[PDB]
Every structure is written in C-alpha cells, then in structure tokens.
Scaffold this active site. Sequence first.
Site, PDB file in Angstrom:
ATOM      1  N   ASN A 149       0.882  -1.150   0.000  1.00 48.89           N
ATOM      2  CA  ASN A 149       0.000   0.000   0.000  1.00 48.89           C
ATOM      3  C   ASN A 149       0.928   1.210   0.000  1.00 48.89           C
ATOM      4  OD1 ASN A 149      -1.296   2.345   0.968  1.00 48.89           O
ATOM      5  ND2 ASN A 149      -2.728   1.215   2.285  1.00 48.89           N
ATOM      6  N   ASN A 180       3.135   5.277   2.429  1.00 47.83           N
ATOM      7  CA  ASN A 180       4.567   5.600   2.399  1.00 47.83           C
ATOM      8  C   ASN A 180       4.862   7.060   2.739  1.00 47.83           C
ATOM      9  OD1 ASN A 180       3.746   3.374   1.052  1.00 47.83           O
ATOM     10  ND2 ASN A 180       5.353   3.429  -0.509  1.00 47.83           N
ATOM     11  N   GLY A 188       9.112   1.408   2.006  1.00 40.70           N
ATOM     12  CA  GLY A 188       7.734   1.057   1.704  1.00 40.70           C
ATOM     13  C   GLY A 188       7.169   0.026   2.655  1.00 40.70           C
ATOM     14  N   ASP A 237       4.907  -2.577   4.203  1.00 36.69           N
ATOM     15  CA  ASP A 237       3.895  -2.349   5.207  1.00 36.69           C
ATOM     16  C   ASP A 237       3.264  -3.687   5.561  1.00 36.69           C
ATOM     17  OD1 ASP A 237       1.893  -2.820   3.061  1.00 36.69           O
ATOM     18  OD2 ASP A 237       2.695  -0.919   2.322  1.00 36.69           O
ATOM     19  N   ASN A 271      13.020  -0.793  26.730  1.00 30.96           N
ATOM     20  CA  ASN A 271      14.207  -0.285  27.395  1.00 30.96           C
ATOM     21  C   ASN A 271      14.392   1.198  27.117  1.00 30.96           C
ATOM     22  OD1 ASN A 271      16.958  -0.374  28.612  1.00 30.96           O
ATOM     23  ND2 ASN A 271      17.649  -0.212  26.484  1.00 30.96           N
ATOM     24  N   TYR A 313      23.676   3.404  23.472  1.00 28.83           N
ATOM     25  CA  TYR A 313      23.867   4.240  22.286  1.00 28.83           C
ATOM     26  C   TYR A 313      23.348   5.594  22.751  1.00 28.83           C
ATOM     27  CZ  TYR A 313      24.644  -0.162  20.021  1.00 28.83           C
ATOM     28  OH  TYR A 313      25.172  -1.435  19.890  1.00 28.83           O
ATOM     29  N   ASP A 367      16.934   6.215  27.962  1.00 26.02           N
ATOM     30  CA  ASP A 367      16.707   5.046  28.808  1.00 26.02           C
ATOM     31  C   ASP A 367      15.639   5.166  29.896  1.00 26.02           C
ATOM     32  OD1 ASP A 367      17.203   2.336  29.411  1.00 26.02           O
ATOM     33  OD2 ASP A 367      19.064   2.736  30.483  1.00 26.02           O
ATOM     34  N   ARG A 379       9.074 -10.594  21.269  1.00 25.11           N
ATOM     35  CA  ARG A 379      10.528 -10.701  21.154  1.00 25.11           C
ATOM     36  C   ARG A 379      10.891  -9.454  21.913  1.00 25.11           C
ATOM     37  NH1 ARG A 379      16.072  -8.955  19.241  1.00 25.11           N
ATOM     38  NH2 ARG A 379      14.923  -6.990  19.196  1.00 25.11           N
ATOM     39  N   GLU A 399      16.281 -10.901  23.754  1.00 27.97           N
ATOM     40  CA  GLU A 399      17.605 -10.767  23.150  1.00 27.97           C
ATOM     41  C   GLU A 399      18.694 -10.410  24.133  1.00 27.97           C
ATOM     42  OE1 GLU A 399      18.634  -7.101  22.260  1.00 27.97           O
ATOM     43  OE2 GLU A 399      20.008  -7.366  20.585  1.00 27.97           O
ATOM     44  N   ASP A 445      21.630  -7.765  13.174  1.00 27.24           N
ATOM     45  CA  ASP A 445      22.728  -7.121  13.894  1.00 27.24           C
ATOM     46  C   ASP A 445      24.048  -7.794  13.593  1.00 27.24           C
ATOM     47  OD1 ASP A 445      20.937  -5.306  14.988  1.00 27.24           O
ATOM     48  OD2 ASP A 445      20.854  -6.289  16.943  1.00 27.24           O
ATOM     49  N   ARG A 457      20.134  -5.385   6.150  1.00 30.24           N
ATOM     50  CA  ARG A 457      18.693  -5.151   6.087  1.00 30.24           C
ATOM     51  C   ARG A 457      18.220  -4.649   4.722  1.00 30.24           C
ATOM     52  NH1 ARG A 457      20.724  -3.540  11.796  1.00 30.24           N
ATOM     53  NH2 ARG A 457      18.910  -2.579  12.762  1.00 30.24           N
TER      54      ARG A 457
HETATM   55  C1  LIG Z   1      22.803  -3.560  18.535  1.00 25.25           C
HETATM   56  C2  LIG Z   1      22.916  -4.387  19.804  1.00 25.25           C
HETATM   57  O1  LIG Z   1      23.982  -3.788  20.597  1.00 25.25           O
HETATM   58  C3  LIG Z   1      24.236  -4.468  21.879  1.00 25.25           C
HETATM   59  O2  LIG Z   1      24.894  -5.680  21.648  1.00 25.25           O
HETATM   60  C4  LIG Z   1      26.309  -5.723  21.957  1.00 25.25           C
HETATM   61  C5  LIG Z   1      26.561  -6.596  23.150  1.00 25.25           C
HETATM   62  O3  LIG Z   1      25.852  -6.104  24.274  1.00 25.25           O
HETATM   63  C6  LIG Z   1      28.088  -6.614  23.463  1.00 25.25           C
HETATM   64  O4  LIG Z   1      28.334  -7.625  24.426  1.00 25.25           O
HETATM   65  C7  LIG Z   1      28.996  -6.886  22.175  1.00 25.25           C
HETATM   66  O5  LIG Z   1      28.816  -8.200  21.773  1.00 25.25           O
HETATM   67  O6  LIG Z   1      28.491  -6.090  21.069  1.00 25.25           O
HETATM   68  C8  LIG Z   1      27.103  -6.302  20.818  1.00 25.25           C
HETATM   69  C9  LIG Z   1      26.794  -5.758  19.463  1.00 25.25           C
HETATM   70  O7  LIG Z   1      27.161  -4.419  19.367  1.00 25.25           O
HETATM   71  C10 LIG Z   1      22.979  -4.688  22.673  1.00 25.25           C
HETATM   72  O8  LIG Z   1      23.296  -5.616  23.664  1.00 25.25           O
HETATM   73  C11 LIG Z   1      21.811  -5.231  21.827  1.00 25.25           C
HETATM   74  O9  LIG Z   1      20.626  -5.174  22.592  1.00 25.25           O
HETATM   75  C12 LIG Z   1      21.620  -4.410  20.590  1.00 25.25           C
HETATM   76  N1  LIG Z   1      20.558  -4.964  19.756  1.00 25.25           N
HETATM   77  C13 LIG Z   1      19.125  -4.534  19.874  1.00 25.25           C
HETATM   78  C14 LIG Z   1      18.450  -4.665  18.513  1.00 25.25           C
HETATM   79  O10 LIG Z   1      18.673  -5.960  17.958  1.00 25.25           O
HETATM   80  C15 LIG Z   1      18.963  -3.606  17.557  1.00 25.25           C
HETATM   81  O11 LIG Z   1      18.485  -3.934  16.252  1.00 25.25           O
HETATM   82  C16 LIG Z   1      18.459  -2.178  17.957  1.00 25.25           C
HETATM   83  O12 LIG Z   1      19.164  -1.174  17.174  1.00 25.25           O
HETATM   84  C17 LIG Z   1      18.444  -0.106  16.633  1.00 25.25           C
HETATM   85  O13 LIG Z   1      18.923   1.131  17.209  1.00 25.25           O
HETATM   86  C18 LIG Z   1      20.332   1.359  16.953  1.00 25.25           C
HETATM   87  C19 LIG Z   1      20.712   2.646  17.683  1.00 25.25           C
HETATM   88  O14 LIG Z   1      20.006   3.788  17.180  1.00 25.25           O
HETATM   89  C20 LIG Z   1      20.627   1.372  15.416  1.00 25.25           C
HETATM   90  O15 LIG Z   1      22.072   1.451  15.191  1.00 25.25           O
HETATM   91  C21 LIG Z   1      22.547   1.960  13.990  1.00 25.25           C
HETATM   92  O16 LIG Z   1      22.234   3.344  13.902  1.00 25.25           O
HETATM   93  C22 LIG Z   1      22.785   4.093  15.018  1.00 25.25           C
HETATM   94  C23 LIG Z   1      22.246   5.494  14.930  1.00 25.25           C
HETATM   95  C24 LIG Z   1      24.297   4.028  14.979  1.00 25.25           C
HETATM   96  N2  LIG Z   1      24.826   4.706  16.138  1.00 25.25           N
HETATM   97  C25 LIG Z   1      25.453   6.029  16.050  1.00 25.25           C
HETATM   98  C26 LIG Z   1      26.986   5.886  15.966  1.00 25.25           C
HETATM   99  O17 LIG Z   1      27.396   5.201  14.765  1.00 25.25           O
HETATM  100  C27 LIG Z   1      27.456   5.110  17.226  1.00 25.25           C
HETATM  101  O18 LIG Z   1      28.819   4.684  17.050  1.00 25.25           O
HETATM  102  C28 LIG Z   1      27.309   6.030  18.534  1.00 25.25           C
HETATM  103  O19 LIG Z   1      27.435   5.225  19.707  1.00 25.25           O
HETATM  104  C29 LIG Z   1      25.931   6.816  18.633  1.00 25.25           C
HETATM  105  C30 LIG Z   1      26.111   8.229  19.247  1.00 25.25           C
HETATM  106  O20 LIG Z   1      27.164   8.945  18.605  1.00 25.25           O
HETATM  107  O21 LIG Z   1      24.625   6.144  18.581  1.00 25.25           O
HETATM  108  C31 LIG Z   1      25.085   6.804  17.344  1.00 25.25           C
HETATM  109  C32 LIG Z   1      24.789   2.569  15.008  1.00 25.25           C
HETATM  110  O22 LIG Z   1      26.204   2.541  14.787  1.00 25.25           O
HETATM  111  C33 LIG Z   1      24.089   1.746  13.913  1.00 25.25           C
HETATM  112  O23 LIG Z   1      24.395   0.363  14.078  1.00 25.25           O
HETATM  113  C34 LIG Z   1      20.104   0.073  14.827  1.00 25.25           C
HETATM  114  O24 LIG Z   1      20.271   0.080  13.438  1.00 25.25           O
HETATM  115  C35 LIG Z   1      18.630  -0.093  15.169  1.00 25.25           C
HETATM  116  O25 LIG Z   1      18.147  -1.304  14.635  1.00 25.25           O
HETATM  117  C36 LIG Z   1      18.667  -1.870  19.489  1.00 25.25           C
HETATM  118  C37 LIG Z   1      17.650  -0.903  20.061  1.00 25.25           C
HETATM  119  O26 LIG Z   1      16.396  -1.024  19.426  1.00 25.25           O
HETATM  120  O27 LIG Z   1      19.937  -2.031  20.104  1.00 25.25           O
HETATM  121  C38 LIG Z   1      18.971  -3.075  20.370  1.00 25.25           C
HETATM  122 CA   LIG Z   2       4.093   1.239   2.117  1.00 25.27          CA
HETATM  123 CA   LIG Z   3      18.069   0.303  30.620  1.00 31.77          CA
END
Ligand SMILES: C[C@H]1O[C@H](O[C@H]2[C@H](O)[C@@H](O)[C@@H](O)O[C@@H]2CO)[C@H](O)[C@@H](O)[C@@H]1N[C@@H]1[C@H](O)[C@@H](O)[C@H](O[C@H]2O[C@H](CO)[C@@H](O[C@H]3O[C@H](C)[C@@H](N[C@@H]4[C@H](O)[C@@H](O)[C@H](O)[C@]5(CO)O[C@H]45)[C@H](O)[C@H]3O)[C@H](O)[C@H]2O)[C@]2(CO)O[C@H]12
Ligand SMILES: [Ca+2]
Ligand SMILES: [Ca+2]
Length: 684
Positions: free
Chosen positions: A29, A33, A51, A53, A139, A195, A199, A227, A257, A328, A375
């Site tokens: 749909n 968008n 897109g 949906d 969270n 990140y 929180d 999940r 997770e 991830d 993705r």
């Molecule tokens: C992603 C994953 O991180 C952690 O896992 C780590 C383990 O804890 C650690 O032991 C070791 O093994 O590393 C692991 C992997 O890094 C958490 O524990 C997990 O819960 C977490 N996964 C959850 C979801 O599966 C994940 O899809 C989801 O991520 C969403 O939000 C993030 C943050 O916005 C998106 O990340 C991308 O875009 C952001 C904007 C980028 N960050 C910016 C910058 O590059 C970074 O370096 C800086 O720290 C800043 C500030 O300057 O935040 C910016 C990031 O680099 C990209 O990957 C992601 O695409 C989105 O799906 C969640 C939250 O929903 O994290 C959970």
């Molecule tokens: Ca759509």
């Molecule tokens: Ca927390």
Amino acid sequence: DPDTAVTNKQSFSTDVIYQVFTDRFLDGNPSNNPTGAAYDATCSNLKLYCGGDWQGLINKINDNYFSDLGVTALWISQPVENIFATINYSGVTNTAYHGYWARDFKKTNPYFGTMADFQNLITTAHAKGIKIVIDFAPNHTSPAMETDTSFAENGRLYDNGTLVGGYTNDTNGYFHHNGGSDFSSLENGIYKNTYDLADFNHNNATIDKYFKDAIKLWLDMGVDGIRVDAVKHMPLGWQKSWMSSIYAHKPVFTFGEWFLGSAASDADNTDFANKSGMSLLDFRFNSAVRNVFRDNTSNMYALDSMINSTATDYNQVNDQVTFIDNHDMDRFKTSAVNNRRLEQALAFTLTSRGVPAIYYGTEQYLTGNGDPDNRAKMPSFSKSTTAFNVISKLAPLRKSNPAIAYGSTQQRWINNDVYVYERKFGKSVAVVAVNRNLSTSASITGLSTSLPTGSYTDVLGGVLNGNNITSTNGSINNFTLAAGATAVWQYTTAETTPTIGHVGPVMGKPGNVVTIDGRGFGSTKGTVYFGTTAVTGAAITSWEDTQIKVTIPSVAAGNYAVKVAASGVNSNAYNNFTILTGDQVTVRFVVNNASTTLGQNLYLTGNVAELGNWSTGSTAIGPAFNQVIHQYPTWYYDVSVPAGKQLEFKFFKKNGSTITWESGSNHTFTTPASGTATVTVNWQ
Ligand SMILES: C[C@H]1O[C@H](O[C@H]2[C@H](O)[C@@H](O)[C@@H](O)O[C@@H]2CO)[C@H](O)[C@@H](O)[C@@H]1N[C@@H]1[C@H](O)[C@@H](O)[C@H](O[C@H]2O[C@H](CO)[C@@H](O[C@H]3O[C@H](C)[C@@H](N[C@@H]4[C@H](O)[C@@H](O)[C@H](O)[C@]5(CO)O[C@H]45)[C@H](O)[C@H]3O)[C@H](O)[C@H]2O)[C@]2(CO)O[C@H]12
Ligand SMILES: [Ca+2]
Ligand SMILES: [Ca+2]
C-alpha cells in the site's frame, strides 16, 4: 486443540519463525509511504524507509508464499508508532524504519498500517495457520541529546497521544540521566543509555504501569508472542514482575535478546534464561553454527560441545530461539561462503533443539555485511532455490515428528567434518547426518541409532546429496556420506503411554493456566501433579492426547516438577516450574554502609520464595549493585516481590565459601498493592 495448532500461543517448538523487517519486505500500500525526505522508492539508500507495510505481508500470506515455504509464524518489526523525525548522524540522514525508535507504544505505526490493518494481519495470518510474534523494546524511546531539545524528538514518550514527557526537564524522572553506557559491567549497561537512546527508569510507578498497560493492548489484539529487545539492558527484577502481569492476563511465548559474542557459557545470561520467566535468543548456538559452517574457525567437536553445554545450563533448552544470522550481524551468505554451507546451517538449525528462526531473504541467498546492508529489500519471491526446498521439506517435521520438536539430542558419530546426531522422544526418532567437507566424501561404518529395524528414505529427497539407509535394530549398514551431503532419516509412531514434551509458561501465580503439551496422554481427564500436589476435575480445563490445560493450584510458592497421570500411568517430570506467591511488584532494596572486603559480594534473602526463603544459594538475590544508581558502600538491587505483603529480610556477604549475616533483627517491609517502591535500610 492439538499442541501443533495455530491457537497454541504458549509453545513454539513445533513452529518455524520468519523474522521479517516489515519495511524491507513488501510495499503493499503506497498510500501509507512517507513523503519525500525520508522515503526511497528504489530502496537504494538503506537508512531511509522503502515502503514495506502490513498489507504486503497480508498479500504474501494470501498468495501462499509462506505456506509453500513452511514457516508457521512471522516475527515482525516493533509495531508501535515511532518518531517521525529524521535524524542526521555525521552527514547521513537516518530514519526509524527498523521500528526501534518508539514514541507512543499505544498506537500503530502509520507507515506500517493502522489498527484495522493490524487486525487484518492477525485474522489473515491465523486463518492460514501462522502465529504472529512481535518485537517490543521497553528499554527506551528514541535518540536524544539531554542538552538539546532540537535533536530528534528528544526521546519524547506519549500515551495514546497525550505527551507524558521528554528527556530534558524530566522532573518526574521517567528516564535515567547517568550518561552513556560503556558496557564495562552488567550494571553499567542497565542504568546508562544504550547508544544515544533515552533510557527508561522502570522504578517510576508511572512507567511500570504504562508498560503493563501497553502490552495488554497488543495481546488483546491477538498477537501470539513477543521478542523483547535489549533484555540485557533492563533489570531482571523488573522484567520478571512485568512478565508475571503478562502471564496473568493472556499468556504468550516470550523470548528476549541477550546479545552474546562467543559460544561460551555465560553466568548472567544463564541466570536470566532460568530466573526471568522468559527464554532467550540463543546466541551461543549461532556462534557455533557460524564458526563451523560459515567462518571455518572451528570443527564439529565445537558443535557437539555447544549442544551438550546448553542442555546443561538452561532449565529448558527447548525454549531458546536459534538462528544462523540476524539484523545485527553480517549476513550468513558471503563471497567465500559456498551456497551448500548455508543450506547445511539451515538443515542443522531446523532439525536441532529449540524454536528455530529465519531472517528474511535467507531462502534467497541474500547478502549484506553490517547494519544497514544486512537489512536490504526482499530481492525476489522465487520459490525455486535449493534453500527454499530445504526449508519447505524440513520445516513441516517440527509439526509431524515429536522428536524434532520436543526430543533430546545425542551424538552417534563424529570427527572434524562429520556430525551424526539423534533426536528422540519416546518411540519417535530423527537421525541427521552432515559432512561439511565439500570435496571429500566419508565412509561411515559401525553406527548405532534408535531407528527400529527397517529401510529409511532421506526426508530431503536427496536434494543435498543425502542417501537412504537400512537399520537392523538400530545398527546401520555401512555407507558413504556424500561430499557436502546432509540427510535425514526418521521414524514416528503414535505414542500410547503419557509423556510431557513442553510446558509453558513455566512460571506463574496459583490461579493461572499453563499448557502442558505432549503425547500419549489420553482422552480422559486424568490427574496433573505439581510435585506431590494433585489436580483434577474443574481445575483441568482441557484434556486431549496431545495437550492438557490446567489451573495452577494454590500452594506454597516455589520450584516444582510437573507430572501428568494418564489412567494410573505416571509420565516423565518437567522440572523447574516456578510458582509465585501471587501478583508481583518490583522493589528496589538499598543498603547503606555495607563495607566489604576484596572479592566479597552482597546478597539478599527473605521470608518468601521470591527472595529465596532464607537461602544463601542460587535462590538468593545478588550479587547487588554498587556503582551507578547508588555507590559503594551503598548497595542496591531491583527485585520482583509479592504485592501487598509483609516481608522480612537480611543481607549477607559471601566472599569465598563463607557467609556473614547482618546482625540483629530482620528488616521488615510491606509492599504496595501495585507498582514499584524503593526501600532503604542500614547494614545492622
Ligand atoms: C545492537 C545491539 O547492541 C548491543 O549488543 C552488543 C553486546 O551487548 C556486546 O556484548 C557486544 O557483543 O556487542 C554487541 C553488538 O554491538 C545490545 O546488547 C543489543 O541489545 C543491541 N541490539 C538490539 C536490537 O537488535 C537492535 O536492532 C536495535 O538497534 C536499533 O537502534 C540502533 C541505535 O540507534 C541502530 O544502530 C545503527 O544506527 C545508530 C544510529 C548508529 N549509532 C550512532 C553511531 O554510529 C554510534 O557509534 C554512537 O554510539 C551513537 C552516538 O554517537 O549512537 C550513534 C549505530 O552505529 C548503527 O548500528 C540500529 O540500526 C537499530 O536497529 C537496538 C535498540 O532497538 O539495540 C537493540
Ligand atoms: Ca508502504
Ligand atoms: Ca536500561
């Protein structure tokens, strides 16, 4: 209803999950968008919306794509309404296409659909016999810069429209303002932002209430599972409490997770799978599978170790969600990684223990390294690949052979390149044979199995160079396992004596209903046993050969085994059934000037099962926290306690093998009827 029906929201061992990134799948749909700035029809730039949906999913359920594939439940992106802002990180625009930047958990995401399109998803999905698991990330809200309301939406949270509060000037304290987490310790990661994400402070009764109410809304719509995102960053104490309010309302299969890096055992992750009230996403399995099949950094003995180890560390290894890749991480398929290796990791995963999950596009050998290239958009809907075949032939087995769903595992033959495991449940058997060496075949000789005498045909029809075998009392004739082959042999027979395979949920207050799935029960309502305590008549709401439904008896909170008696016949026991004292509330225990020596840790125990019952073992609560919210010598911990109840408790230090209790009389506290509370005391 059979254990395998689509109405069995408490067990997924018979199912196969298809994790889809709604946006990236199918634009059904175009009216929904987004406009200009954050939309891309070519879906070239991956950070923007594309897109995809809910209608696209409906379109695909209807035109039988998922049915010929064999998946029986789809795990979609967080359905709630996200922030409309467009965030710009170092030059590149970023949008909330992933769904993780929640804004108002009470409405639907307009870009994905409406409440009405959401019902459609359920009704349609359930009609074609497919469950719906949904992502939910309690969270946090969205990215936010404490000192700048201009940056994105400043983590603003709404309640069905009404603005609860932002991150700046957060007077009520709905969020933590302890700066960025550097992931150095477990507590550093729960109380500091992940990140740049706002929180949530779940000790704020308003937040605690908000979330219990939000999830109710989605359950009432008919979702079959959840999940939970970043469970590693929220207190287990609170999540448990949250989890019991869910099991008290409409119990669904919840798994979270806990991101892990290796395949090694991990103390915390294991205490979580066992004590939280939920199962995790099996990251240890994923490392093994990836090391052996994709990366080539380990051999078959690493697989066998992970199989044996995870069965030992988890009370219910069967509730863990396995997967070869996800959003991830680097996509399993890569230039070096041969197509057959992916197909094998898929076979192995589908026939192994636990609820299997498949990231979308894996059936199409989709590639992409890193976020967001992993993705990408669904490139095609061809039902012609070899991977498509493997999935569609093996997947149904979870529904037909109980050894694949409920069965235990056991090695029958192995060396660095070949693995042969058996999966059995009562009389039903499943042998799997794998040769990851892509150039050399193997001469398997002297192999026992529990396949009764007969001649077996590879369930895969040989698509993967599998062969057929002959049993003579489990003794398998000599045979050459082809190069890169993998074959599956089975045997299944209607069970006559009772036997439990799965129970869920495995926690709850007396008065709830749990589902005891299994085989060989019978048509006549018999007797359920929580340990030594019997249950009969009205207490048992349903009773079939494949699935019983009972009301948790009103008895002393605690660990209990679960037995079923089919007409004077006792079955195997399902151990580790936690019975709670009743409705739970989260409570923050704080203790002042509790000095301790080097390596000496603080713990907590009280006069109820939720606190361990004067125990200093594993039923105890700890170790405590002494860094972020409160600093050493002041310790603190968030715990799930019975609501409206007079409590007694003491703290104790446990350095080596020795214990030292705080002296004097027990501390006392009566808990609220609902919500959360902070109780402070001094170390006597
Ligand atoms: C992603 C994953 O991180 C952690 O896992 C780590 C383990 O804890 C650690 O032991 C070791 O093994 O590393 C692991 C992997 O890094 C958490 O524990 C997990 O819960 C977490 N996964 C959850 C979801 O599966 C994940 O899809 C989801 O991520 C969403 O939000 C993030 C943050 O916005 C998106 O990340 C991308 O875009 C952001 C904007 C980028 N960050 C910016 C910058 O590059 C970074 O370096 C800086 O720290 C800043 C500030 O300057 O935040 C910016 C990031 O680099 C990209 O990957 C992601 O695409 C989105 O799906 C969640 C939250 O929903 O994290 C959970
Ligand atoms: Ca759509
Ligand atoms: Ca927390």
